[model samples]
Target: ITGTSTVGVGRGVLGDQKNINTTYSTYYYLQDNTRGDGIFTYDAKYRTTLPGSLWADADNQFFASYDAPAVDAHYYAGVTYDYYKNVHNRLSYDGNNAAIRSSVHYSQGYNNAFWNGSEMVYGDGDGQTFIPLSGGIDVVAHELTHAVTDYTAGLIYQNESGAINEAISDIFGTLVEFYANKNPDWEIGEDVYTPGISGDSLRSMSDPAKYGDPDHYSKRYTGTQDNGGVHINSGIINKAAYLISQGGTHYGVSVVGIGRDKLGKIFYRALTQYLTPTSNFSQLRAAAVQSATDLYGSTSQEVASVKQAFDAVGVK
Candidate 1:
């Protein structure tokens, strides 16, 4: 709580340069003490270990080209922390300013990232599918949001509920990206996805069908693979969420876009106040409707749009 006297200018994973706020300790450390207990980044050294070391530096500076992923991991985690605290009045992922940790360069050409139920883990992608995952704020936020779900609604990680869990992460993850306003878009992982391929991304909220994901509940995958299609079925809710914010016509149904600000308010309320461990698609619709009603009143267009969005997604 010494008020963040540390600053480290560095290049991020995507070759972008930015200044990162860190801590001034025995050695200049990759720790953001201002944003809660602290946001810490570690190097996994292309191995399966959890967190290797503190990622120390000689001075308070970290502009090394090799420090790219660590820089992004540390900085993005801070941004995500600030996003939760500022937007939702939430403190860290656990709502108690828990020490946020990230391990980057995990598993050579690993091509993935996750929250691991405790801390964040990122991979240096195979370069064909993704770049350093920390380069994408949405990806970082998405995984951290899983930690939030683990603490808040405790959404189950299988079947319909699991899909809800996954969707919640994508929803808030996208919101955090928007919150940062870094060339923001509804597409997730666009910053780090398909380095060699232009105009390609990991997922699309605007139209999940683009990546073979279902945009409607009727199209939800019932297969046992991928944790019962947690990633696949999430597209349904993701579409619904996108419609709730950006409004669009889908499957012969229309919804009035409520804008991202109100969209965040409504969803945050539902996620924190109403959603539960076993909540499924229908339950999510109910929670969102009630959340919108609570925020904008029962007779308001927000509530109407919420209902319309859910209907458009075949969430009935």
Candidate 2:
């Protein structure tokens, strides 16, 4: 899309209408030329091939219908970019205003989404389970934050480090959802998962046990599957993050809530400044405590709450 940038209106996968940044040349394309090199959206057209064709439309008005995935993928990605840049003062996923790209309708009945190191990929989902995953702003933000984690902490994708990676994504994704204030909660993928079922999400950060994920470190899955239980064990860290933002008590340890903004400040500082690729649970506790101490004095309640939250979740 080599043309002037334009603003367009569209409806998402769930028929929610919103405005999207687009590029206009021959037609309205799902490419935000204003950001970085560009934020692009492609249509996989039910194929395994990635970064398919750039989505083009005659007009910007995207009615609620078959092409809604393209509309939402483009729109939510812009929202995520805005969140990182405005909320955290981060420029895109790499902090250098890197171009964001996404592929939608990625194979027939594909039910998962991922960040493939360089770009994001989304699936239309099986009708029995999810809808087009990009329809959920949290899910879009989650996939994009994986790129942010890779660029910052470079967290390894296995074992405890991998659990940290997963938790970081869940945390920021939830935060982005809250930032959007779209019926947000400490739940992941709730808006896009199991459309037939109400009040259920893929995972719950406030109470991971609600979806069979471990809340305490002792309950962690030590299996080799799921990359050493990356998603499963992430619940432990997610619970700690939840406790930091909203006070809670667990395993006899109590933490007073510092609110969401402070929680994000501490965690983001730790992520960009302290974490290493091989960092584990114990290392994460130290990093978070240090981050809080750096932002607020060591004797401050923020630092104490960080310690208490980690301890509450059995991080020690």
Instruction: Give the winner by lDDT.
Output: 2
lDDT of 1 at 186: 80
Clashing residue pairs found in predicted model 1: none
State in Å the error of residue 161, model 2: 0.5
For model 1, residues 31-119, the per-residue Cα lDDT tens digits are 78777878888889889898878787877666776689999888888888898999899999889989999998899999999988888
Best by TM-score: 2
Q: Give the TM-score of candidate 2.
A: 0.98
* lDDT tens readout by residue for model 2, 1-316: 6797889888788878778888889898888977777799998989999888998888877784767988887877877788888989998899898889899899999899999998899998897799889888889998998999999999999999999999999999999899888889999988889989999999999999987998998898997999999999999999999998899787788889999999998999999999999999999999999999998998999999989988887888
Regions of model 1 farther than 4 Å from truth: 1-5
- The Cα RMSD in angstroms, rounded to one decimal, for candidate 2 relative to the true structure is 1.0
Candidate 1, poorest ten consecutive residues by summed lDDT: 1-10
Task: State in Å the error of residue 316, model 2.
Answer: 1.2
